[PDB]
Design a protein around this nucleic acid. Structure first.
Lengths: 110, 53, 292, 73, 196, 79, 151
RNA sequence: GAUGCCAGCCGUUGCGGUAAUUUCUAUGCUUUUAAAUAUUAUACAAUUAUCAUAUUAAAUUGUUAAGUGCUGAUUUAACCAAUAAAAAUAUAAAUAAUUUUUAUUUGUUUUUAAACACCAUUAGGUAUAUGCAAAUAUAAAAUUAUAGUAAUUAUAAAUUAUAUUAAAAAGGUAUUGUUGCCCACCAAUUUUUAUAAUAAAAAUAACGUGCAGUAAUUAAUAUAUUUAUAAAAAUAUAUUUU
């Protein structure tokens, strides 16, 4: 997945440590991951990638002036047609639709 | 002598273990219909299969 | 911290370095801890089990004029019944160890006789010599019990051994009379004992006593002989305490741990008023009964 | 992560398995070990896709549930 | 020799590097250590650290086997009482008229019998300590995670069926009504993992 | 040795002389010299240490890197 | 539903605490602040007041209608009580956020001073001259390992 | 002899708290004698090695189940709304070795007018494998760190008083050891930089909310949905480093 499952070498003990990872290091790296997830969920991190882009070079939708959260920073430059697509889709993810496959609908999505 | 119960039941019991045979079914189920667990009444795997079905 | 300073006590004429270094410590993270012990003249030798390093004429004078140590120990134990002495567990225990000295050879030869299915013909001088040399070096400490038993059960006996056996034995485990006669012959040819009938008696009685146990002839190879972790001597296999198997029974006072000295207790280390709260001594009797 | 030890930790019993990892295996499904003396197409008895060993019941006749049965040795 | 070889005049004898770096272990093994019991983490009877262990896990139901304090029936005075529905329903507490002689007659044998059964279980511990107990030196087996490698087997197999991919993956929980309300075109009975 | 940029000794230029506190258990008031130098047209700032002594004002400094000191983050010292 | 805290407090706590308890006010739930561990009635009332001036400063933006009832200040307590308007009928009749005023502030201050002189006890806890070590990092002056110039 | 946590030594653990054999000086003393110091090159494993580079594998769909009398204190610890009775079946059987490197693929699924559950709360939503979505099952060169930041970090058995046996079995992130440690947000600082409300990371020793981890006050650990003053929690999965 484009997500990184381990944000850190959680499994690091002496070889033959008969477990994936000690509970200590697991807690250390769950703290790193709680920081990363709160950073993302609180700066309202939004990424995106659309067909027929170089899918590795991600799109920063949260870095768009129509969905910007900061005020003194400039998010990113994006073509107008693609912008009207994306930000309309971000608005579209603001609700889940009865009569379709449902979705996890969060406050921090809007 | 045969731990996991490969020799229980007796060959006749198989042929009499069908669907129209609650009589020979119910001689391996608990007073409520429960199977006696494999640690407890170690049955032959074929017996267990024929019996569940 | 109101930090405490302790100036190190330096050695003196009066207060020697050894005492000033063990009776005293200048680092007060050990103060008021507890009372340690150590052994000196004869306590050290008693505990450490250091045999006297022999010599020629002089050690042999001290060693020849020994006489029957087991008896003289008994003499010294009973003499505690005279008027000027008390019968002491320390005397009894010196007797007990002077009698149980040959524990090793006895537990071994009993294992050999009674735990070795089909031990060749032990009465045949071949296996008898294996037996003699092994038990001889089981006493005299040159071999361990475990390694010597492996040397016994591994020594060379007869070619086509299983094939000769399956002709003489149904289940393989032969008659033990040749074995025990061989072992008693062993300990009576080798002067393992000063008083001969003792060898046979222990060899016989330990076997008789074990004959009562469940699985009375299997031994878990670990605990069976010496190793790192062992069993308490009441639970050893062919040992002398296994019949001394019992336990204690306690009704404590309302105040029983306090009075830990009040009774008619033998004191090796007598109390003095600095630790002794109100204790009077082991001889005083506040509640006397009239009697001629 | 905080990149430096917060603990005066000093546990002293180092398992022989943690040191000599070239010899013992503490992963599950690697306890079968190195069996070169099987017949299988591997020496790594845990990579043989063939006969997964029942661990609780076998061994009455062959030592341990690892080793091959006395009719396949 | 004159002493056992698993102890020194200072404690247990250190064998390997663990003993030599942590020599607490040689002279301390629980609130019931005694210089005779050193290292032997079964110590005496009744004291602390005394329980025999059967293949790792320790034993504390030694009477609860014989039936002392486990499933007390003993029946000897019990059948007597249950019989005397007269002197069971009377002021149940006399040498009442007749049957309390027989009640104590049965109990007189109960007493001797339970003393014999208790001595049996005492010898049982003192036997099982010789010839079964590992003395806690072997690893536990009473938990489902000393059979980590027995669940690895039946994970590895279900993988192999799942094309060697979904090791440890399990079939997703569907529903109560999963196989019988869901609509036409979507797999009602939960597939294995590697189908999805 | 990132800023030594490979040479055995590197010359730099004094700017500030601020004091940093070493890493525990140690205690001191260690002299950290915030220096600079131009090299490879980019100009660089080098937070360094001072074990030498100073008699004349000389923003000529010969930073040679050393081991670790009780200060966290100062790999460079004076000659 | 009480909400107490200690005396020395950062605006951090002031902001998000007033926010917590005033959201509680928005939840019909009873409202009371108190300090019990105060170094002086003055610090106690000042902390009460910074909390109330964060409370109402938030309350006006968030449109909540709640009225204050009592301020029970004593030797051992500095408290405020608040009460919200549960339904919007009551709200609309009284679109009012009612907090005490400067008079009541100073008067309760004097009351607590009079009680604290009846008791002669001026602080349930004390800040200590014991300074813990502090390392100043970047500094143009020598400093002791506790944070005071080396002169 | 001075210095007294300071100044300084610092290859290095660490030293320096009024007697420093760890600084400065003096003095001796010491050496195996091209002097001292600074930066670099200087020889993985292969028989067993747990987080994200797979592949010889048998499997996929089966229409079953549960419902009307009556007068009402069930559920949980405490509340809260306000009908609740319910979902079992099928074996042989698909050959192995050879270049699928996009191909396929690893637990979010349609519908209450049908429910349990869960969440919010009296006034609802959600209520469970048709897109989408590689990912534990190890091919390996020391921790951290987006592959530039400090000099490491993880670890297991020693040691720790009460769970109705005829008194008996138990753990530690501490290392005289729970009045023990750590933990996060919360202030300045510093230093490098891939500057998403307020960027990210490295070091550190204030104040403050608390008490989040050490089986630890509703057990912890990984993954994920949601939640939020922070350590985290509800939830859904596994798993015992419980």
């Amino acid at each position: 997945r484009w997500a990184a499952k381990f944000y850190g070498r959680v499994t690091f003990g002496p070889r033959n440590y008969p477990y994936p990872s000690s509970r200590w290091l697991a807690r250390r790296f769950k703290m790193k991951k709680h920081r990363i997830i709160k950073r993302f969920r609180f700066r309202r991190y939004k990424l995106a990638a659309v067909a027929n882009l170089p899918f590795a070079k991600m799109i920063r939708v949260g870095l768009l002036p129509e969905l910007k959260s900061s005020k003194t920073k400039k998010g990113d430059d994006v073509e107008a047609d693609l912008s009207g697509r994306l930000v309309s889709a971000v608005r579209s993810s603001g609700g889940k639709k009865k009569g379709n496959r449902g979705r996890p609908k969060s406050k921090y999505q809007i | 002598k045969d731990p996991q119960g490969m020799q229980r039941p007796s060959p006749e019991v198989y042929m009499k273990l069908n669907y129209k045979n609650p009589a020979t079914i119910s001689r391996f189920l608990t007073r409520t219909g429960h199977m006696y667990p494999a640690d407890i009444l170690p049955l032959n795997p074929e017996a267990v299969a024929k019996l569940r079905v | 911290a109101k930090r405490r300073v302790i100036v190190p006590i330096h050695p003196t004429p009066n207060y020697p370095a050894h005492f000033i270094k063990a009776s005293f410590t200048t680092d007060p993270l050990k103060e008021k801890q507890k009372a340690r012990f150590s052994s000196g003249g004869e306590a050290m030798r008693e505990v450490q089990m250091i045999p006297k390093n022999l010599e020629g004429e002089r050690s042999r004078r001290e060693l020849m004029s020994r006489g029957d140590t087991e008896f003289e120990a008994l003499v010294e134990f009973i003499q505690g019944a005279s008027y000027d002495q008390l019968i002491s567990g320390r005397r009894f225990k010196k007797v007990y160890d002077k009698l149980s000295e040959n524990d090793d050879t006895f537990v071994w030869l009993c294992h050999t006789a009674m735990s070795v299915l089909n031990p060749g013909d032990v009465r045949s001088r071949l296996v008898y010599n294996h037996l003699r040399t092994l038990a001889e070096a089981v006493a005299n400490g040159e071999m361990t019990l475990r390694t010597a038993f492996r040397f016994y059960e591994s020594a060379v006996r007869s070619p086509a051994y299983r094939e000769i056996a399956k002709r003489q034995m149904e289940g393989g485990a032969a008659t033990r009379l040749a074995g025990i006669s061989a072992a008693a012959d062993v300990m009576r040819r080798m002067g393992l004992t000063r008083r001969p009938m003792a060898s046979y008696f222990e060899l016989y009685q330990r076997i008789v006593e074990r004959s009562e146990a469940m699985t009375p002839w299997g031994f878990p190879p670990l605990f069976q002989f010496e190793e790192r972790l062992s069993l308490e001597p009441r639970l050893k296999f062919f040992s002398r305490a296994s019949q001394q198997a019992l336990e204690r029974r306690r009704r404590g006072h309302i105040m029983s741990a306090y009075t830990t000295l009040q009774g008619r207790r033998i004191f090796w280390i007598p109390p003095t008023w600095n630790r002794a709260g109100r204790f009077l001594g082991p001889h005083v009797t506040l509640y006397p009964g009239m009697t001629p | 992560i905080k990149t430096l030890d917060v603990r005066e930790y000093r546990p002293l019993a180092t398992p022989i398995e943690f040191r000599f990892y070239q010899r013992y295996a503490n992963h599950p499904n690697r306890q079968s070990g190195i069996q070169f003396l099987t017949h299988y197409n591997t020496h790594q008895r845990f990579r043989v896709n063939k006969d997964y060993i029942d661990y609780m019941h076998w061994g009455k006749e062959q030592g341990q549930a690892r080793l091959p049965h006395r009719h396949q040795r | 020799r004159q002493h056992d070889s698993g102890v020194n005049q200072y404690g247990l004898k250190p064998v390997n590097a663990y003993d030599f770096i942590n020599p607490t272990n040689l002279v301390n093994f629980g609130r019931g250590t005694s210089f005779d019991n050193l290292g032997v983490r079964r110590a005496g009877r009744g004291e602390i650290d005394s329980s025999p262990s059967l293949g790792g896990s320790p034993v504390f139901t030694q009477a609860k086997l014989v039936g002392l304090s486990g499933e007390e029936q003993l029946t000897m005075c019990q059948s007597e009482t249950m019989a005397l529905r007269v002197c069971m329903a009377r002021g149940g507490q006399d040498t009442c008229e007749r049957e309390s002689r027989a009640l104590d007659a049965c109990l007189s044998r109960v007493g001797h019998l339970r003393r014999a059964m208790s001595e049996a279980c005492g010898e049982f511990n003192d036997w099982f300590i010789q010839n079964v107990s590992d003395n806690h030196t072997k690893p536990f087996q009473h938990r489902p995670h000393d059979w980590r490698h027995f669940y690895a087997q039946e994970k590895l197999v279900r993988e192999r069926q799942q094309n060697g991919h979904a090791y440890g993956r399990r079939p997703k929980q569907f529903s109560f009504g999963a196989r019988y309300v869901k609509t036409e075109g979507y797999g009602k009975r939960p597939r294995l993992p590697y189908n999805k | 040795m990132w800023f030594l940029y490979g040479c055995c000794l590197r010359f730099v230029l004094f700017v500030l002389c601020y004091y940093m506190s070493p890493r525990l258990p140690s205690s001191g008031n260690r002299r950290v010299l915030y220096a600079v130098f131009y090299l490879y047209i980019f100009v660089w700032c080098v937070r360094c240490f001072f074990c030498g002594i100073f008699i004349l004002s000389f923003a000529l400094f010969i930073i040679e890197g050393g081991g670790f000191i009780d200060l966290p983050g100062i790999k460079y010292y004076t000659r | 539903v009480d909400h107490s805290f200690r005396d020395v407090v950062d605006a951090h706590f002031v902001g998000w605490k007033s926010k917590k308890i005033v959201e509680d006010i928005k939840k019909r739930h009873p409202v009371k602040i108190t300090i019990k561990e105060f170094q002086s009635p003055e610090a106690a009332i000042g902390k009460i007041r910074e909390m109330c001036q964060a409370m109402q400063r938030y309350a006006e933006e968030k449109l909540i209608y709640h009225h204050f009832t009592s301020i029970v200040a004593n030797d051992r307590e500095v408290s405020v009580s608040f009460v919200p308007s549960l339904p919007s009928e009551k709200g609309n009749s009284w679109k009012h956020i009612k907090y005490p005023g400067e008079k009541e502030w100073a008067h309760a201050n004097k009351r607590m001073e009079e009680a604290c002189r009846k008791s002669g006890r001026y602080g349930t806890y004390v800040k200590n001259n014991m300074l813990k070590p502090r390392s100043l990092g970047q500094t143009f002056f020598r400093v002791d390992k506790y944070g005071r110039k080396i002169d």
